[PDB]
């Protein structure tokens, strides 16, 4: 089972492809989705559970849609689950079906129809704090049993999903370290007071970890500016355009597609907006042709292009 053996061994590697930093972030999971396939845990559990603590935008989603590609061959293997949606009484029924009897029984449970189909999944629930109380209690039997019974009785295999939640709980307390200069590992122990305060010990210590993600430097935004223009360097490539860019243009997009609130989120319309927006004129103008080499620079008014002309 070579195939199998060495995704495992080089999962941090294989989750790197597309996931950039948070180094120890993807060291705990691959850690822990080692220990499950070597044969260490309880076989009655999903195969990993983790909770992902510090801000939007730096790569919670990423993980969770790389983990289901390499993992479960395709980034459609992930299922999201928005706890927005199930703060009232009734968020019991849509995650697990209306009881029989009830208006929305034929169609089940959104959580439980969509590892029925799929089995072999990601699931990630997104601010897991805004969550019913209610809620939490199938999530617990879930984490517990590996499995859970939906409206029509039918039980429901979690034992081949990894569980991911999400939580800005933990942000406030990050975003001040390590600024005033806490350690690379303390991390995870100063931010587990809040987290008490939040959830009960039942749900935390049957989590396979408590990850930690970080903001971004700024030449990881750049290497995010770089995978997330992969898409427009291949369609160009169609044409035998190729594109590039200086380093004070690849900045210039990374300065304008980061905030410390939003994250990383801005960027692939920033990316729109100031480098296909005008690139797309000059194709339509005629400056831009069928194998132009392309360099792109900045300027006064936003990116510049240039067409080394018979040289
Ligand atoms: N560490 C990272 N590696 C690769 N891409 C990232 C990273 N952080 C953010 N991105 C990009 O920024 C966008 C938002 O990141 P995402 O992980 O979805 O944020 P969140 O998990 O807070 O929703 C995504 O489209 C993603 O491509």
Redesign the pocket.
Known sequence: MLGEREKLLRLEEELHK?????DEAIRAVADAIRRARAGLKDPNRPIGSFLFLGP???????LAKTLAATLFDTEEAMIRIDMTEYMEKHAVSRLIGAPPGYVGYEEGGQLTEAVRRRPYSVILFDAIEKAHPDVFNILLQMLDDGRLTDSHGRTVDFRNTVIIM?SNLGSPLILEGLQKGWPYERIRDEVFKVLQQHFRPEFLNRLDEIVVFRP?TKE?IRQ?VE??MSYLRARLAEKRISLELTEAAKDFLAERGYDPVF???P??RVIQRELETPLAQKILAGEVKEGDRVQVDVGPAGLVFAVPARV
């Open positions: 597309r996931v950039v930093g948070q939007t935008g730096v790569g919670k989603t990423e999400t971004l990881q995010i995978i997330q994250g990383a989120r960027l692939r």
